[PDB]
Design a protein around this ligand. Structure first.
Ligand SMILES: Nc1ncnc2c1ncn2[C@@H]1O[C@H](COP(=O)(O)OP(=O)(O)OP(O)(O)=S)[C@@H](O)[C@H]1O
Ligand SMILES: Nc1ncnc2c1ncn2[C@@H]1O[C@H](COP(=O)(O)OP(=O)(O)OP(O)(O)=S)[C@@H](O)[C@H]1O
Ligand SMILES: Nc1ncnc2c1ncn2[C@@H]1O[C@H](COP(=O)(O)OP(=O)(O)O)[C@@H](O)[C@H]1O
Lengths: 582, 245, 568, 117, 122
């Protein structure tokens, strides 16, 4: 009949057992039954945020009907998953949709109060038969709803509920709101323990139950895209397919929690991966790798090494971010170099990061540049720069440079940030900063540091510059810092080592060009004499390397003088540096 | 205290409406709390606040760092505390007569750290309420039921806080699988290494962070520790180290 | 069948072996096997720019099925492909999209899930008038659908990441553009099929030349599509050259011909001094300095996070400073149209910076945008021109330091505006009379050093630290500017010969034209407008009276103080 | 014009396509207004799209760049059987030569003469 | 003046946009006799409108000088003269014609008062 054409019996499928076991949801199914045994407006609607198991509530109710675990008034009923695409499709003629829907309604009256109706996507039922001068499904179902003589069950997302049903109050009051919350962690672990049998029967592999509880735990903590139980189910399924292809292509036979971590790190790259000996010996050689690019300035290397080790070691403060820092020193001591060193350690690249230089924000209102603009105003549909740049890749490094340049009340934003890792952009959603490192640099007591780094300890220098910082900032803000570090002007040996590093990357780029070039150490001594001052550090070394290398060497390369394969000693002139061809 | 209220009231720490005024430093952002008026950009998204109170009425509104905002944002809260009805851009009223509106500030905390001693609670509330009257209007502060004053935390409170943070540290490390003891003297080293009455309790926490976790994460990542071992936080002369027994 | 209406079997031709021997992109096929062997959510989607061979990915998967190179759950399948461009274009009224859609769904339910479907343009599925998310999203969750999606990330997040319920089923597979060497590997995998088609041979040096030049010069279509197109059309051209009325191997010469029509790079960089004197007379040392700086930028020794060249220009304006920038843009990248003239005379405030970089959101000039950075974003290979940089607000120099340090600049709208492909020209006139009055017999270098010390006392030292070289722009004499006036007369005669008039000139008339608007204080454009307004206006007055005839010799003979035109 | 059944015009179309497959590449076809074959009213464009993607079609299209860009390039298999073969506007001199090709045609029709100036 | 207003429009617009202008041209306030000539033009079109009404009008040159001294300042534009014409001619004239007084055929001579304008029927 017409019920055969447009409806699908879920209860016959659960009678075949071809539906999923549904475990839990007891108050939700009980209130759904309480609404379904009424006199007027029998119709519960499963308002719940997208992917918390709303279809599975009705499927589990169908299974409880088949098992006979319902009250006596529901024993022997039929749940029919109504189809909207079956009804819209065949009707470009006038009245043909209304013909079908009225025939369905007369069949449902004919079934004598035995058919439970399930309508997935109730928001699809709203704009259903919207042809020019045509009733939708609302204008035809709406009689039989509030006489109680239809046993509809809605299932809709809450954002679809606002736009598509709360806009139409008449059909909005015909139903009964059933909030279906995202489950907490422990109950989701229980549900996943229920569903282990299905995936074991599907992929013929086994699952570690610690991997299950780790998938639920890490999914609730780190992934902010989807919602429970959906994200954890997808973790388990994708791990199962990965193990199946590891076996079948070319080891193991189960699904460990390390496989869960590999799935999560493949999905984003938050380094939940366990400390393998390459990674763990890398992490124990933290300061050694930081002094592969940054000579000197030991104490901040120590502090950030400590913070990243406490992050990776499973001792993360789960609400504050990784490290809430503050760098302080005179101009040109490689503060940005240390930040690029962290980026290169973490991501194998300097500019795989976000640097936002706060000298651009010397006015107040650029707060709205990084957090966005409210509803109504100009740049609403774009988001703040900082929030979006986190919202793509949350495991990153957020760098603020020249923090003395901006207005003091930009730093209520970072009060939020360093309190909880939370930030709310102009559209009004939270952005998790629990995988970020915040570094702020200034040159506050640079006169005081250049004056008194000699003949003083590190500690009371930090004390005195902290007093200067309290003269600068707010007591709220500097409480949020994990650790304030102090930089110092470098000796000439540090600048000679930096010149060695610049010669290393120069010879790297000239082997890329294809030239075997060496240097006299006297030329290194002359370059150390040239770009040196205690007041400015190595940016004079930058310009000295720039001029006295990049001008004559590249001038003689383009002069046809430098032949590849020749030994090229960068020896000295009387006042300059000369290359040879030997 | 507000998150403890959320934990009592909803069995959950982070289930509350935390709208921190620390973004609202202009007269603009009234729009982002009550939605855009019709014809404008985010009209059909509503306010952030009135949508999320129309969903679950029984909740906690939290406004941390409430003095940072431009002082004429609070007129929204004149409405919220007169009747508890708010009218977003789509004309509708969201009835706040079950919500628990809480605001936290520090408008006179120099004065409160200075004179919580040698004056009673009453005259302190009087004087800091005069300060708030200098910072707000008589419209607003006449709506607030109780404006409490908080004092800093002496050594006993610091010891209790240190115990609770070490409880949550052991609670994290139980899933990491390392039941760790402590010297009772090491609590005194944390107290003497976390004590400063001008910043309250967070220097205690970051001193705990450094002086415990850095040897601990140093030794766990060292390839040294095996789960199940009785581990103690014995002191050195100045350090505190973890031992394996 | 309805399968004989909108579906395409690729296991058909792959069982026949009559498709592309798809080589490469193994990992994307592997992740497609990862998604398709799940129990649920078995509809992978492919993400990339159009023309990256996603159809070839599906066909190579089909060939691995035919070859048995797949695991034992992918076998017996039938590769299908549904149109998203006829289910709507045939759809007149209510339910013709949905009618065909449900007919496809039931006829695949007859197929019992042994069928893999392809769908391109997943963005088209969302908006068609409701349509298909509400009818495939059950099959997306039922698992009986075995779709293969294919679209681009921008349409994906514009349309499809709106509804997260549609987002949670499809699994993103990034298919980027392949490299030039991956293109080489694919074409070496496909040179056999070409040479078996046209019965010719193919030069593999011409293959790598075609790949490199297609990567460089043309960015309309991309790899591997443009390489296939150029190889096939060049092979067709060689085939016509054989069958016209002689080589079978397609050469890179025909590649360059179809390239430019349908190589002068390296030595043009080497001869850049001659290039700068192709249109500009005088300023020989400045020409040499600019050409050496260009070659050093092309030498590939400097910072890969710093631009082509940092420059500050001084001297008397209007003499060819802008003309140097025009010819520099011409023989640098294209032509006289990749440049932005910017006066720094205006910008003297904080909202000056808010103008030029970009407004914060919620404010006045926001999607009107920054005056500089939007024009950079439109023309990523240009030359940036600045005028009267001493009239700038001092915080603009912080932005200039960000330019010369990082080669990039976050605008007000919040994105990355790269600067490593342009030339920063900043012009000033602070040491004007230091060069003008001391033009006589003083060298280029010590005048440069003297005005360098002067501007060092003027500007910030850290600002001019970043500047590579400040050329002098010495005031050109009467002979150079007279020659420029002669070149303007030449292009004038060119346009009038386009109109078609034999026009001569007296040399005394040439001297009076050179002495109309010569001025060392203002520039060459006073001479230009002087000669222009003297000649042009009585000319057409004589013309449209009915006096001048095309073909008559028009000598610009002198009057006592004017120039008269004759018709002989 | 000679068809009025849904299955006789389509029968003619199927029979002509089978004859095009039968002629084995000797026939090189031409059909202007390919977009009109897309929207004629199974429409005929999607009926010939198997003859596109079965290695049998030797037809030529003709339209404006708008319909080729929208009704063809946006389609997939209809894209990958064709090119952007652009018809150029000729010169004025080429136009005069073509006029010389058909001056005598118009003159013999209208019994008049045409001056070359 | 052209150079300075070109600088102004350069502050307004793109610089090479206004290079594409055929010429930056300048409109300006105008002198005494131009006002009298264009007032004679407006009197001519007034004569045309009232001749199509069927009425024929003579003017005093004294009345022309009254108009040129009343509706005059170059600082604004022309239309002060236009509404001066409009008021000081048409309003007594519309008072007289809708009165049903003026027989056609008789010359409408624009005689003057000391300041105002009178149309008579002799
Ligand atoms: N209590 C539960 N017991 C067993 N499986 C569950 C339970 N809750 C959810 N699931 C599973 O979670 C997955 C997703 O739930 P679904 O109901 O299918 O998604 P959904 O509720 O339709 O969300 P939307 O609206 O489609 S985005 C399914 O595989 C369900 O089997
Ligand atoms: N690995 C490969 N081996 C052989 N041919 C390839 C390979 N990768 C791409 N191709 C060819 O490259 C061309 C690209 O065409 P398409 O498959 O249509 O590109 P696409 O990625 O599908 O994007 P569109 O939107 O369909 S043009 C086809 O002719 C493929 O056969
Ligand atoms: N320790 C160091 N290691 C490597 N490079 C350094 C070091 N100190 C200074 N430099 C050089 O000096 C510059 C200092 O950079 P930056 O940290 O931005 O200076 P500032 O201290 O003003 O922030 C860098 O560009 C780098 O080339």
């Amino acid at each position: 009949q017409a019920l055969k054409k447009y409806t699908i019996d879920l209860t016959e499928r659960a009678e075949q057992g071809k539906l999923d076991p549904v475990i839990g949801r007891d108050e939700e199914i009980r209130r759904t039954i309480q609404v379904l045994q009424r006199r007027t407006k029998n119709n519960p609607v499963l308002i719940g945020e997208p992917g918390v198991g709303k279809t599975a509530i009705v499927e589990g109710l169908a299974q409880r009907i088949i098992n006979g675990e319902v009250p006596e008034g529901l024993k022997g009923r039929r749940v029919l998953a109504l189809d909207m695409g079956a009804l819209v499709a065949g009707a470009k003629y006038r009245g043909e949709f209304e013909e079908r829907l009225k025939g369905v309604l007369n069949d449902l009256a004919k079934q004598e109060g035995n058919v439970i109706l399930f309508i997935d996507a109730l928001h699809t039922m709203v704009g259903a038969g919207k042809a020019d001068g045509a009733m939708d499904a609302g204008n035809m179902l709406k009689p039989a709803l509030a006489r109680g003589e239809l046993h509809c069950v809605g299932a809709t997302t809450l954002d679809e509920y606002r736009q598509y049903i709360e806009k139409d109050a008449a059909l909005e009051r015909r139903f009964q709101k059933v909030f279906v919350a995202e489950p907490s962690v422990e109950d989701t672990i229980a549900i996943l323990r229920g569903l282990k049998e299905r995936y074991e029967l599907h992929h013929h592999v086994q699952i570690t139950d610690p991997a299950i509880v780790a998938a639920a735990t890490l999914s609730h903590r780190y992934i902010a895209d989807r919602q429970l139980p959906d994200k954890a189910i997808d973790l388990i399924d994708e791990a199962a397919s990965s193990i199946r292809m590891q076996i079948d292509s070319k080891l193991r036979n189960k699904v460990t929690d390390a496989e869960i971590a590999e799935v999560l790190a493949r999905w984003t790259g938050i380094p939940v991966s366990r400390m393998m000996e390459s990674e763990r010996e890398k992490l124990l050689r933290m300061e050694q790798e930081l002094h592969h690019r940054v000579i000197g300035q030991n104490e901040a290397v120590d502090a950030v090494s400590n913070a990243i080790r406490r992050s990776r070691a499973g001792l993360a403060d789960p609400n504050r971010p990784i490290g809430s820092f503050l760098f302080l020193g005179p101009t040109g001591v490689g503060k940005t170099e240390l930040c690029k060193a962290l980026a290169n350690f973490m991501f194998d690249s300097d500019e795989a990061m976000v640097r936002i230089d706060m000298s651009e924000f010397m006015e107040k209102h650029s707060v709205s540049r990084l957090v966005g603009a409210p509803p109504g105003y100009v740049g609403y549909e774009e988001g703040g720069y900082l929030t979006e740049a986190v919202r793509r890749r949350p495991y990153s490094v957020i760098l603020l440079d020249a923090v003395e340049k901006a207005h003091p009340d930009v730093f209520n934003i970072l009060l939020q940030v360093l309190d909880d890792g939370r930030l709310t952009d102009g559209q009004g959603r939270t952005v998790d900063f629990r995988n970020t490192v915040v570094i702020m640099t200034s040159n506050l007591g640079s006169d005081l540091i250049q004056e008194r780094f000699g003949e003083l300890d590190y500690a009371h220098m930090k004390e005195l510059v902290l007093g200067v910082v309290s003269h600068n900032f707010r007591p709220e803000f500097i409480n949020r810092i994990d650790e304030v570090v102090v930089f110092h002007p470098l000796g000439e040996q540090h600048i000679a080592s930096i010149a060695q590093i610049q010669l290393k990357r120069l010879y790297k780029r000239l082997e890329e060009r294809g030239y075997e070039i060496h240097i006299s150490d006297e030329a290194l001594k002359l370059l150390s004499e040239n770009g040196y001052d205690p007041v400015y550090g190595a940016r004079p070394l930058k310009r000295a390397i720039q001029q006295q290398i990049e001008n004559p060497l590249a001038q003689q390369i383009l002069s046809g003088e430098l032949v590849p394969g020749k030994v090229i000693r960068l020896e000295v002139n009387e006042d300059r540096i000369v290359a040879v061809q030997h």
